[PDB]
Every structure is written in C-alpha cells, then in structure tokens.
Design an enzyme around this catalytic site. Structure first.
Site, PDB file in Angstrom:
ATOM      1  N   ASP A  48      68.976 -39.065  27.173  1.00  0.00           N
ATOM      2  CA  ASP A  48      70.737 -37.883  26.120  1.00  0.00           C
ATOM      3  C   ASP A  48      70.345 -36.987  25.656  1.00  0.00           C
ATOM      4  OD1 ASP A  48      68.719 -37.624  23.772  1.00  0.00           O
ATOM      5  OD2 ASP A  48      69.457 -39.713  22.952  1.00  0.00           O
TER       6      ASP A  48
ATOM      7  N   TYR B 186      62.178 -41.753  10.386  1.00  0.00           N
ATOM      8  CA  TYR B 186      63.172 -41.489  11.734  1.00  0.00           C
ATOM      9  C   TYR B 186      63.471 -39.613  11.637  1.00  0.00           C
ATOM     10  CZ  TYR B 186      66.106 -42.085  15.276  1.00  0.00           C
ATOM     11  OH  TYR B 186      66.838 -42.286  16.815  1.00  0.00           O
TER      12      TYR B 186
ATOM     13  N   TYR C 130      67.405 -47.320   6.737  1.00  0.00           N
ATOM     14  CA  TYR C 130      66.596 -46.845   7.593  1.00  0.00           C
ATOM     15  C   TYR C 130      65.274 -47.592   7.057  1.00  0.00           C
ATOM     16  CZ  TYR C 130      69.426 -44.075  10.991  1.00  0.00           C
ATOM     17  OH  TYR C 130      70.164 -44.138  11.987  1.00  0.00           O
TER      18      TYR C 130
ATOM     19  N   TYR D 219      73.267 -51.453  12.913  1.00  0.00           N
ATOM     20  CA  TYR D 219      73.315 -50.286  12.149  1.00  0.00           C
ATOM     21  C   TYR D 219      74.824 -49.310  13.087  1.00  0.00           C
ATOM     22  CZ  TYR D 219      71.319 -47.012  14.775  1.00  0.00           C
ATOM     23  OH  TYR D 219      71.123 -45.713  16.058  1.00  0.00           O
TER      24      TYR D 219
ATOM     25  N   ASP E  91      67.881 -45.501  24.985  1.00  0.00           N
ATOM     26  CA  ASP E  91      67.840 -45.073  23.841  1.00  0.00           C
ATOM     27  C   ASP E  91      66.853 -45.566  23.965  1.00  0.00           C
ATOM     28  OD1 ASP E  91      68.133 -43.077  22.284  1.00  0.00           O
ATOM     29  OD2 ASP E  91      68.594 -44.363  21.108  1.00  0.00           O
TER      30      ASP E  91
ATOM     31  N   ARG F 249      76.214 -38.974  10.152  1.00  0.00           N
ATOM     32  CA  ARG F 249      77.642 -40.100   9.515  1.00  0.00           C
ATOM     33  C   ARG F 249      77.285 -40.725   8.795  1.00  0.00           C
ATOM     34  NH1 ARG F 249      78.054 -42.651  15.012  1.00  0.00           N
ATOM     35  NH2 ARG F 249      76.323 -41.979  15.326  1.00  0.00           N
TER      36      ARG F 249
HETATM   37 NA    NA Z   1      67.943 -40.637  20.703  1.00  0.00          NA
END
Ligand code: NA
Ligand code: NA
Ligand code: NA
Lengths: 175, 175, 175
Positions: free
Chosen positions: B66, B56, B52, B140, B103, B44
């Site tokens: 996940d 990353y 950012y 974010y 996460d 997206r």
């Molecule tokens: Na992740």
C-alpha cells in the site's frame, strides 16, 4: 517540517484547509505554536476555571494583523492532540477585539468527521453552540484584567474571505 | 528527524524494532503519519462507536504494497501518545484484506514493558485478546460501507518474515 | 527544530529557562528525549504502581555528567504533554545518587502558571510536596532492583548554580 511554513494549506483552500491543532477541546492549558522553532509551547495556564470549548489551532501558510497565522476553532466529536493537523471547512466567522486589537476567529468543522462534515454554515448548529463559544472568548482572559469584545457571528462566506486575505498576506510576507 | 526516514529501525531488526505510534489504545481518532511532512494528521474519526484495542503505529524505514510502512499493533500496560516511538518485538501476524487489497498487521509487544516484554508468541496471550483484535478490524470500517476480511493469525516467525520483506522493499525504494 | 540543540534556553537563564517536557504529571510511562533524533521515546513503563508526581523534563542546551541535559520537575496546576516546552523558574535542588552516579533534579515552577508563578523557593511549598517528591525518586526504580539515594533538598540558589554549570558544559561540548 515546520507546521506553519512547511505544511501545505491544502488543495481546497480557502474553502477547505489544513488546521494545525494547538489546544485540545476541554483544555485549561493555552498552548501555542512557537513561531521560531515550530514546537508547541505553554503560553499560559488560563486564569479562570474555564476550558476551550473545541479543538483550536491555526492555518498553515497564513498571516494576520497580529503577525500570527489565522486562528480556527474546529467543532467535532473528539479531542485532537496539539501538534497534529486535520482537514477542515470554514462555516462561520467570529469577529472580536482583544485589548483594542482585531482578532477574528474562524469557526470550522472537520471534513473527515462523519458527524460534522456535512455542515456548511453556522446557522445549522444548535444556537447554544454559538452562545457558548462567544461566552468563552468574553470570559477566558477576564481574570487577567484584559478586555475582550466579541461581535455578532458572520456567515461561511465571511470566513472564506478572511482565510483568503490571510493566504495573500502570507504570500507577500515570504521573501 | 522525519519519523519514517530518519529514525533507525533498530539494531535488533527484524526481530526487535522501533515502532512509531500513530494511535493510542482507546482512541476513536484515526491518526496517521503524513508521509510528506512527517507530522501526525487526522485521517478520520471512526464511523462506529469503536476504539483501538491497543497502541498502533508503523515501523520506520519499511515499506509494503500500500506504499506505507508496515503496520503494528503493540500490546502493553499503558497508552502511548501519537508521534512517540518505542521498542517492540514481533509475536504474531494478522493477515487481512481491506477492500480487496492486502493489509497485514504485526502483533507486537513492547520490550521495555515489564509485564509484556517476556512474550515471544501470540499463543501465550489469553485467547480473548486475539478474538478482540480480529473483531476490531472486521468492525472498524463497517459503517463506512467498506469490506474487511481478516484471516487466521500466524506465528511470530511469519511476522519477522513480513518485517524483513518490508525492510528490503524500503531499501530498494530509497534512491 | 531539535528540542535539545535548536530551542534557545531563554533570555532569563540561569534563573528562568525553557523546559521541554518529557513526562506528564500522573504518568506511569517513562518517556525520554531520543538524543539522536529529537523524538520522544518510551524508555520504559515503570516497574511499580507509581506515577510521576509532576510534569518532568529537561533544559535545552544544557549538559550534565550522565551526558544528558539537566533534569527538571515542574510544579503547576495542569498536566503538560511530552514534547511541548514551557518557561520555568528554578526554586530548589534535589541531590540524588542513582546506582552510584550523580543525578540531581531541579525543582521548578512554571512562570506562566498564575497559581505557582510567584514562588521563589521550595521552603514556601507545603512541606508535604517535598516529602512526596523525594519518596517518588526513592521508590520508582525499586522494583527494577536499582538503588536510589536521595539527599536533603537545597535552596533556589543551589539550583541556579547547577543550571549555570550545565550551560557551561554544553557550551564546551558544542564544537
Ligand atoms: Na497499512
Ligand atoms: Na490570533
Ligand atoms: Na538525568
């Protein structure tokens, strides 16, 4: 994965589809997919002081008259790098003739771009957007002594139809 | 080579490891690895005017809850392009909860960056670095109406442990 | 396709050839081809406040003493992204010694760049171009305490010869 053959077109096709970006908005470098290798190559540096008005690329597993996948201009907030793909919706069709040969462009938006994802048809855009896009294609090869005729823009349904024809042609081609 | 499966994690793992960059420092585009194809895709465009804070990406041949490879923020002098990889050392762990789901992010440095390669732990960084990073993850997705809870940062050893757990899980997964 | 093994060198080789770009003009990031995977990796961030003076890369299906493909600096109007390839013509050769080891660089132009495509030899360039290039290689590893000796530039024919030797060596290597 080869970005033309191995990337799926996307469950929502012909209306919504993956687009593999070849050229970033603002670029004077005409990158293209190398069909044999799947790598991105420099086709040329544009012969005029012009830049692509939007991110530009092609739809996976599609095929047109010029024996390439169908071309797409994707309107959105941000530049996207060559070789990356995104999900887009077709909102208009720009018919054109390049050196006596058919080369229509799909006008699309990115459905994952919160600013543009609601758009369903080119009539919603500022009229200037369309004016600039048309002019870009009329101008960008002029200094190569090549003739580019662009015609009136057509509605979202004309673009979906084009995408469909191109999916069919690819399917017949794969043997 | 598929950047998740085919790229080695690196001889020095879990302490030192290859990181495949998905997002460049300063970007408003949330690119991600497409797991099936190994291509980089636009997940997206961020819904806020945020970018950012560092390069990353993810660690090859790792696996978390996940069902993705483990995430890494890499602090260094320079932006790095999506789809390229680098060698990094884990220096801290940032636990977080995204929509009720675990996460955590690894904080790392690039061991081939002469400015940052000597760092062994997040306590050495200007405290502001950490403050900004935390705020980025709290902010974010806010404009997506999604809740992100970030907890206190943890030491280099907590990150190495996480990387190890993720290497084990990947190994069990490969069949 | 693996950009070293699977990309053709190009019908016009040794005079005209594909170049796979590793580093963009203006970059302080020393990216390189990872030979095993074909991915682009961060070798290092340069140890000085210096940047590559031109796009930089290697020629597919070639091989030199250092067991890499032959290196090429490509002079043109525009920056080109790592991992993309272009067509170039060799116009000069820059011999150098890096830590007592032979490492010559090919000077080339992009034959699809309308500004530079007519160039056949480095003598046509502003003399300053060559001066800057030489200085870059003498400077770029200085802060790593590594010694780089660059010698006088040599003509287009010396570069074509080098490219040919490198094509032969690759051919013997493939088994
Ligand atoms: Na992740
Ligand atoms: Na086309
Ligand atoms: Na070399």
């Amino acid at each position: 994965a080869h970005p033309w053959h191995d990337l799926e077109i996307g469950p929502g096709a012909p209306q919504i589809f993956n687009v593999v970006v070849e050229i970033t908005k603002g670029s004077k470098v005409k990158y293209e997919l190398d069909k044999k290798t799947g790598l991105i190559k420099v086709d040329r540096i544009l012969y005029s002081s012009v830049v692509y008005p939007h991110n530009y690329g092609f739809v996976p597993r599609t095929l047109c008259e010029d024996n390439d996948p169908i071309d797409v201009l994707v309107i959105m907030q941000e530049p996207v790098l060559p070789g990356c793909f995104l999900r887009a919706r077709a909102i208009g069709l720009m018919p054109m003739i390049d050196q006596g040969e058919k080369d229509d462009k799909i006008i699309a938006v990115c459905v994952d771009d919160p600013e543009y994802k609601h758009y369903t048809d080119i009539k919603e855009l500022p009229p200037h957007r369309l004016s600039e896009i048309r002019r870009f294609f009329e101008d960008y090869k002029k200094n190569e002594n090549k003739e580019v005729a662009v015609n009136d823009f057509l509605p979202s349904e004309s673009a979906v139809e084009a995408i469909q024809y191109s999916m069919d042609l690819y399917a017949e081609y794969i043997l």
